[PDB]
Amino acid sequence: SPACAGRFQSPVDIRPQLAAFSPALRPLELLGFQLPPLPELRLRNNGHSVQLTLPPGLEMALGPGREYRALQLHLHWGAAGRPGSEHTVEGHRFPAEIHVVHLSTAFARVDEALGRPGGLAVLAAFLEEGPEENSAYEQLLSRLEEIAEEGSETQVPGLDISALLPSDFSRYFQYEGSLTTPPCAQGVIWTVFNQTVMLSAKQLHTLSDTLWGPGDSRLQLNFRATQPLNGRVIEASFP
Amino acid sequence: SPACAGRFQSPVDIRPQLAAFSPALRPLELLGFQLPPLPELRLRNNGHSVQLTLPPGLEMALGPGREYRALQLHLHWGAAGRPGSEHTVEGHRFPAEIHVVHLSTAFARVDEALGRPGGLAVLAAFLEEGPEENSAYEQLLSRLEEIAEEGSETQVPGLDISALLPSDFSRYFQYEGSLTTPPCAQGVIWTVFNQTVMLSAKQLHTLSDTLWGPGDSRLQLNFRATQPLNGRVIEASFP
Ligand SMILES: NS(=O)(=O)c1c(F)c(F)c(SCCO)c(F)c1NC1CCCCCCC1
Ligand SMILES: NS(=O)(=O)c1c(F)c(F)c(SCCO)c(F)c1NC1CCCCCCC1
Ligand SMILES: [Zn+2]
Ligand SMILES: [Zn+2]
């Protein structure tokens, strides 16, 4: 896929001392994310990640009139004691990373948005090890054994998607880049939360040790290597 | 057009004290703006403005990965003893204003870009009275008599289109807004230069006193009223 050799790819290393503070970056607005138990949601092992299909009505704004609808979320992870986040911070790789993918409300279809500036926006958060079991993540992690096989799927009860995300929606980094998988389309607005979310070590081991990929392989280390900024400046919403 | 009643319209009153310094805003870059004299360009009195249609190969970048192609430029002006810029600065209206309209390289056509985030980008500079005849502007202004009638046009030799803009491409305001004529589509990135361009009093009088519009009326005061920011924050490339 020649687009994977484009100049403005993701993921990148975030170097906060080189980030550009702009006070124009307002707190993220996420409405309609508190889903009721029904209808249930499709959870799928697609061989590259585990992907949760989101329903209509999850509305997100990166700014005044810059609105988005959530399509899906998925994760990137490592292996036994090996971190697998996509973004890094000053060369540090975190245990895992969640991506919530959104479509601009200026586009009816994903295929129209691919390669167009701001057509797609991803909310990204690092997952770290903490002492407590995370209830929000347990709702998904507890269903991975059902979909251990590549290509399998199941249905899960609706859940509060926003509970999967960090505490402070006013503190993030932002830049324009690409999908981290083929077709590697550019024009994707990446927003990476400053703060992380915590999962227990058992939960992180469950994420990385349960699913199978293409052939006899485990579905692990499903992250792309770091790409150069090529002159892009990462913005920060805080001084 | 219902988009002329959107919340996020242009032009606006720029209040520099309320602008957000964003050091991610680097100097604008232009390529191919220095045209040979042939082929000639078309200069049209369209009844709302005087418009110069630009040829293919004029590239503009707002930053790394934010690439555009120039389509046309046009002017907004007042009348004898009355300023007619569209944008204002702290309530001050300037004698006239130039707009150079560009299409994102993600779109083959204007109608695909309308209403899409960053689909269109305009470079705007204020025109003020200086002591000298501006020789680049004289190439256009010396032809207005040929196109005095509404709907008339004439061919003009190619020229250095960048010579109609300020030499300082580092200091500017930037915000997201709309077209200022129907359909008033939103998603337009407006860049307004700090530095102004100087025309002689005679040039400014030629601009405002030569062209006729729709009816038996002079084409004058062809600016839209300022529109509220409505919570948008204007960014500045300098503190
Ligand atoms: N990080 S990411 O957002 O680029 C991304 C992956 F890395 C993946 F591994 C996957 S799963 C495998 C599908 O090829 C994914 F769906 C998304 N997101 C999809 C978003 C919708 C756009 C087209 C389909 C592929 C990317
Ligand atoms: N300020 S502006 O950029 O909105 C604008 C005017 F104010 C005008 F008065 C005009 S005059 C002719 C159209 O009625 C104009 F062409 C443009 N620009 C055109 C850009 C070309 C692409 C969209 C089609 C029309 C707007
Ligand atoms: Zn991803
Ligand atoms: Zn205009």
Residue numbers in the entry:
A (entry chain A), B (entry chain B): 20 to 50, 50A, 51 to 54, 54A, 54B, 55 to 72, 76 to 82, 84 to 125, ...
Sentences from the paper on this structure:
Therefore, the binding affinity can be enhanced using inhibitors with the lowered pKa of the sulfonamide group. Introduction of fluorine atoms that lower the pKa due to their electron-withdrawing capabilities is one of the choices due to unique features, such as high electronegativity, small size, low atomic weight, and contribution to increased lipophilicity. We expanded this strategy and created new routes for functionalization of pentafluorobenzensulfonamides including para-, ortho-, and meta- substituted fluorinated benzensulfonamides. The bulky hydrophobic groups at ortho or meta positions are necessary for the favorable hydrophobic contacts with the amino acids of CA IX binding pocket. The sulfonamide moiety and trifluorobenzene cycle of all observed ligands fit in the conserved region of the CA IX active site, the cycloalkane tail moieties were guided towards the hydrophobic part of the active site and moieties with terminal hydroxyl group were located in the hydrophilic part of the active site. The sulfonamide amino group formed a coordination bond with Zn(II), as observed in many other CA-sulfonamide complexes. All four crystal structures showed that some conformational changes have occurred in the CA IX active site pocket as compared to other known CA IX structures. X-ray analysis demonstrated novel, previously unseen conformational changes in CA IX active site due to ligand binding. Our compounds exhibited high affinity and selectivity towards recombinant CA IX, reached nanomolar CA IX-dependent functional effects as well reduced hypoxia-induced acidification in a variety of cancer cell lines.
Human carbonic anhydrase IX (CA IX) shows limited expression in normal tissues and is significantly up-regulated by hypoxia-inducible factor 1α (HIF-1α) or other alternative microenvironmental factors in a variety of tumors. CA IX is crucial for cancer cell survival because bicarbonate and protons, produced upon CA IX-catalyzed reversible hydration of CO2, are necessary to maintain the cellular pH balance: bicarbonate is transported into the cell to neutralize intracellular acid, while protons increase extracellular acidification. Therefore, CA IX has been proposed to be a promising tumor hypoxia biomarker for diagnostic and targeted drug delivery applications. Sulfonamides are classical CA inhibitors, where the deprotonated sulfonamide group is required for displacement of the catalytic Zn2+-bound water molecule to bind directly with Zn2+ in the active site to inhibit CA.
